Design a protein around this ligand. Structure first.
Ligand SMILES: *CCC(=O)Nc1cccc(Oc2ccnc(N)c2-c2ccc(Oc3ccccc3)cc2)c1
Length: 271
């Protein structure tokens, strides 16, 4: 209504029900929109984000729509802190979910999680939209066990330089290809690399990648052409798929479309 752009939600329409946690942007809450609809509400800590650039990009993000992509509903601006309003993912972040051993996952379920994410990434790829920080910690799980990709693109607007470049102590070294670590060369192929690392995370039930190394050591390992190896729960066909994301040469890495086809083939073959 009056005073609100299409990308703009009225905060007054929100009822907060439960606190969900605190990240580097701060607090995230579960609540309702206009009394009925489940939403998540992420509150951006003052001073943490390039807010104007983000708000403008929010307009683009609103047009992104896929069943395996966390749906942005809108943003609450001209209040501090600003809110990001999205669909609510009841079972939380993929990473913690994988580490909960009680689930006793079948490898079928793990392959499906991979397929969930790969569908989202094929969609983003089809819209020439890079994630830039794909990892288990950023994927979410809904009440039906479906995995969706979240925080897509968001790292572009983080002001904390510990997060922003390779020479930073909070950069995702472990999810980065050699050309990112060496030259900061981002592309669809650095999203691919990170996806194979995510398949590894999934098949490893949430182990941190290169868990015995520091980031610095990991970068050296990668630069020398050494790689993550096969998780116990991954078949040879699945390992082949994740390993193919890590070709030293970016143009030799597959697309998300080819990855999806590979994953469907393995699914049919191991069904
Ligand atoms: C595994 C790490 C972890 O604990 N993450 C975590 C913890 C608490 C709350 C979190 O965010 C949630 C939780 C549940 N549902 C949703 N939707 C979210 C959430 C909400 C908003 C955003 O922001 C963006 C989403 C999509 C695109 C850009 C921004 C992200 C997650 C997560």
């Amino acid at each position: 209504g009056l005073g609100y752009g299409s990308w703009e939600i009225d905060p007054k329409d929100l009822t907060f029900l439960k606190e969900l946690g605190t990240g580097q942007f701060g607090v995230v809450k579960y609540g309702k929109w206009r009394g009925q609809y489940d939403v998540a509400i992420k509150m951006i800590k003052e001073g943490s984000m390039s807010e104007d650039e983000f708000i403008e990009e929010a307009k683009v993000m609103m047009n992104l729509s896929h069943e395996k992509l966390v749906q942005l509903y809108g943003v609450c601006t001209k209040q501090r802190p600003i809110f990001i309003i999205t669909e609510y993912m009841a079972n939380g972040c993929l990473l913690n979910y994988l580490r909960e051993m009680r689930h006793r996952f079948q490898t079928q379920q793990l392959l499906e999680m991979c397929k969930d994410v790969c569908e989202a990434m094929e969609y983003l790829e089809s819209k020439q939209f890079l994630h830039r920080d794909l990892a288990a910690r950023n994927c979410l799980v809904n009440d039906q066990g479906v995995v969706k990709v979240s925080d897509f693109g968001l790292s572009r607007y983080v002001l904390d330089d510990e997060y922003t470049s390779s020479v930073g102590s909070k950069f995702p070294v472990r999810w980065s290809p050699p050309e990112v670590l060496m030259y900061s060369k981002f592309s669809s192929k650095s999203d691919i690399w990170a996806f194979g690392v995510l398949m590894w995370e999934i098949y490893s039930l949430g182990k941190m990648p290169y868990e015995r190394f520091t980031n610095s050591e990991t970068a050296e390992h990668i630069a020398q052409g050494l790689r993550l190896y096969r998780p116990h729960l991954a078949s040879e066909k699945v390992y082949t798929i994740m390993y193919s994301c890590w070709h030293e040469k970016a143009d030799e890495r597959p697309t998300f479309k080819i990855l999806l086809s590979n994953i469907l083939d393995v699914m049919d073959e191991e069904s």
